[model samples]
Target: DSPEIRELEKFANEFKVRRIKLGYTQTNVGEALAAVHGSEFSQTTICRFENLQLSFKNACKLKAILSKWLEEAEQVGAKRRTTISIAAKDALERHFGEQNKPSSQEIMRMAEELNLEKEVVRVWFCNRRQREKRVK
Candidate 1:
């Protein structure tokens, strides 16, 4: 399925395509990513990121950068709603990483750990479990 590779490529291409759609130069993209990532980067570095020549170490920062650009790009065009927000997504990420099906209390605790709202986390956990069930 090339799932991981596809995921990586999807993010990379989106970096390029979304930036282009926003009339943002690669330098702007690089600067934005660097700023969001709290580091220094160059246009070529950003180009490489888009080209999949490098992988991001700061996933949270990269997610923020993508969110910023994609939000703008979606405004210019239309983009479907993601399955969830980044916070919800990260909650699920931790859920799976922790290798446990979280109880409501556990889910609430995890939400607090991630600084997400408990109700939102509860809804996300419920919906995501349903979605996973459908996949199986």
Candidate 2:
């Protein structure tokens, strides 16, 4: 591995640990960017980031976002707890059963209806798709 890759690998491992310590999941991190920073990131993207699977440019971008979030988190001294209501889960599952793939408009509609972040809804669908594929 190149020096950059090695550095990224270390950062990836540390970031995942830091996220967990802050009581966040891959999905939560994905959602927080949209909810907190007006940015979009899916859970798959977050997963790839934690696994050091992204291209260097993408990794750098994500690292910047995550690093800044960490700094803000440290200063705030508080963690915002995200809860997925049963109703939201049911709605997401219903949508997944109908179609694993949804357009951005559809996802936005779901997010608004559910009173959740769009990235949260997006990640839920992405995770459900992978789960279904593994089960098959």
Candidate 3:
């Protein structure tokens, strides 16, 4: 086979994995890529490119565009890992000690009071409780 064919195949596999590592979804990158590539790519187009369903020429063009996008985006914030503060962690621990399981609204209220994300509070409760099972 030709070098170009192999390169396309190699990146076809790599792009999907790396896209996940970089915390982007197919549609997510598709929307942001409009300004960069000067064309609004549909989710289907990007999805097809990742799956090698696009024409050879179209895949080459998207490969170049995505490679450049990966180059630029990797240098940026990548993804924000929202870490809770010491105070917040302390409060969450205290709340967990009182009651490991919180109702949906209780979690929403706690997050609002602590100025943290609802998901963060909810997930923290689940995670903090699970650690107890492994201690044995």
Candidate 4:
């Protein structure tokens, strides 16, 4: 266990070194992962990986993707944004009232009902937490 834990975590120490050394933020690595890999791994996930806040298996899987991306890039591409509808925004506020943490399925229903991307709701809650963390 110590052998694997030390070895696995040791890799990302370089990920941060290179991720920063090569000009990347967590979100920068995030959106780029989707465009290049066709999967939506976002900033929250990246932060978790960086901090070892993810599971052993989850952390292990994140490494291969990071390893490969490091070879491919110097930086990211852009032309993206979000501003959910008042209906959606108001609904988000309503949800935030309760705790601001929704399940995978809850985000699915909100985004599915609002005619939006799961990323939108997920990002909403993600960014929403940043505020409280800032305030606290």
**CA shift at 15, candidate 1, in angstroms?**
2.2
lDDT of 2 by residue, 3-109 (tens): 87777778888888888888887887887776457876788988988876666777877888888887776566438968899998998888887878999999999
Q: Please give the lDDT score at residue 44 for candidate 3.
A: 82
| Index of the highest-TM-score prediction | 3
**Residue 4 lDDT, candidate 4, scale 0-100:** 74
RMSD of 2: 11.0
lDDT for each of the candidates?
0.62, 0.79, 0.80, 0.77
The regions of model 4 sitting more than 4 angstroms off are 74-136
Q: Candidate 3, residues 46-118: lDDT per residue as tens digits?
A: 8878877766677788899998887777778368888899999999888888788889999999999899989
RMSD (Cα, Å) for all candidates, in order, is 14.0, 11.0, 13.8, 9.6
After aligning candidate 1 to the native by TM-score, how far in Å is the CA of 40 from where it should be? 3.8
lDDT for position 120 in model 2: 90
Candidate 2, residue 10: lDDT? 82
| lDDT ranking, high to low | 3, 2, 4, 1
Could you tell me the TM-score of candidate 3?
0.53
